[PDB]
Amino acid sequence: GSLRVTMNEFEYLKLLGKGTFGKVILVKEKATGRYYAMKILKKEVIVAKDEVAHTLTESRVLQNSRHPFLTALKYSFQTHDRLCFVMEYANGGELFFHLSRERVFSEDRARFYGAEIVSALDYLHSEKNVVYRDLKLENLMLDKDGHIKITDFGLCKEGIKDGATMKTFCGTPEYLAPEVLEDNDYGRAVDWWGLGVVMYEMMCGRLPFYNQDHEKLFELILMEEIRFPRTLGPEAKSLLSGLLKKDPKQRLGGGPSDAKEIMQHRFFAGIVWQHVYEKKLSPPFKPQVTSEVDTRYFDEEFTAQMITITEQEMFRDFDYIADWEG
Numbered sequence: 001g002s003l004r005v006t007m008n009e010f011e012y013l014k015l016l017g018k019g020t021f022g023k024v025i026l027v028k029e030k031a032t033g034r035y036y037a038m039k040i041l042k043k044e045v046i047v048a049k050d051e052v053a054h055t056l057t058e059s060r061v062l063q064n065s066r067h068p069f070l071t072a073l074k075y076s077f078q079t080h081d082r083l084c085f086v087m088e089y090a091n092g093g094e095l096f097f098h099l100s101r102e103r104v105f106s107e108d109r110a111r112f113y114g115a116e117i118v119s120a121l122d123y124l125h126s127e128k129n130v131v132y133r134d135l136k137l138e139n140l141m142l143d144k145d146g147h148i149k150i151t152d153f154g155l156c157k158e159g160i161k162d163g164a165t166m167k168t169f170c171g172t173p174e175y176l177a178p179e180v181l182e183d184n185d186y187g188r189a190v191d192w193w194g195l196g197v198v199m200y201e202m203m204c205g206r207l208p209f210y211n212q213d214h215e216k217l218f219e220l221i222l223m224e225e226i227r228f229p230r231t232l233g234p235e236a237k238s239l240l241s242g243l244l245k246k247d248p249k250q251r252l253g254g255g256p257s258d259a260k261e262i263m264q265h266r267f268f269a270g271i272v273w274q275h276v277y278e279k280k281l282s283p284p285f286k287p288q289v290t291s292e293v294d295t296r297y298f299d300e301e302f303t304a305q306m307i308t309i310t311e312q313e314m315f316r317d318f319d320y321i322a323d324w325e326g
């Protein structure tokens with residue numbers, strides 16, 4: 001008999017996040033003593049907000065992908081009223097928690113993270129024919145060793161081989177690529193724009209383009225030549241200007257060699273790309289967690305809270321059990 005996963009096979013320990021569509025809880029599988037982050041989604045709030053397409057895209061990408069820097073789905077199962085994603089638990093918390101406190105990262109620290117993101121995106125593009133589209137600091141986490149985890153696969157576009165184009169208008173206003181705003185028919189190069197915004201935020205301490213009014217913010221993305229700090233070297237200014245070229249064709253990685261264009265840039269000199277993949281590169285920060293229940297790198301606004309528990313043909317191919325252990 002096939003391994004069946006249900007809610008009662010988990011101990012519900014800590015609230016990590018909570019919102020409109022549901023909540024994230026730190027869980028332990030009773031049978032194995034292993035810890036996971038269960039994302040519980042209210043079937044009604046997904047159905048009501050027209051997020052079914054996104055949820056299923058997330059489940060499909062999660063089932064079909066395996067990379068060290070992509071968050072891994074252990075189990076996905078459902079009740080009459082709930083959608084459950086049993087995710088690999090990232091003990092290092094959100095990268096925003098870490099950058100919000102350090103203000104800036106060293107060139108060497110952003111180098112290490114950017115190379116891991118490059119590895120993951122090269123894989124989605126070259127191997128899986130998937131365009132990620134939602135690369136922002138908000139979707140980056142750290143595992144227990146200090147390696148990057150990219151999360152949130154709902155905004156993915158599948159079946160994109162070669163110079164293939166997309167039409168959807170999605171992403172976080174602040175991270176949206178020029179081509180996306182110009183409402184064109186954009187390609188895989190939107191992920192490299194994303195890489196530039198995140199690495200700028202990393203090495204600089206602020207977004208390259210910001211204004212509270214959406215109209216004005218867009219104009220900066222569309223026109224402003226990126227400002228830089230005096231402490232930042234030239235290689236990093238090149239990479240940033242490179243990924244932040246307004247024209248996807250001009251942009252570093254916008255060419256037919258895709259990620260190879262970025263991997264060869266001077267900022268990445270000396271790195272062995274097969275080693276980036278292999279976690280052979282030593283992390284610049286080691287999360288200082290004492291146990292898996294140590295939620296020091298998580299928001300107290302959720303952790304301190306007490307956990308309280310709050311059509312069918314649509315979520316057909318949702319269920320999953322991974323073939324891997326742990």
Ligand SMILES: C[C@@H]1CC(=O)Nc2ncnc(N3CCC(c4nc(-c5ccc(F)c(C(F)(F)F)c5)cn4CCN4CCCC4)CC3)c21
Pocket residue numbers: 016017018019020021022023024037038039040041071072087088089090091093094138151299302
């Ligand atoms: C499942 C996820 C991904 C993974 O594979 N492993 C993992 N390991 C450890 N923690 C994880 N969590 C911790 C909680 C965090 C969060 N979600 C909401 C949250 C908000 C609204 C919602 F509707 C949901 C929902 F999707 F669960 F419904 C969660 C609020 N928060 C905290 C606040 N930050 C979010 C961005 C800015 C600050 C998301 C990341 C994960």
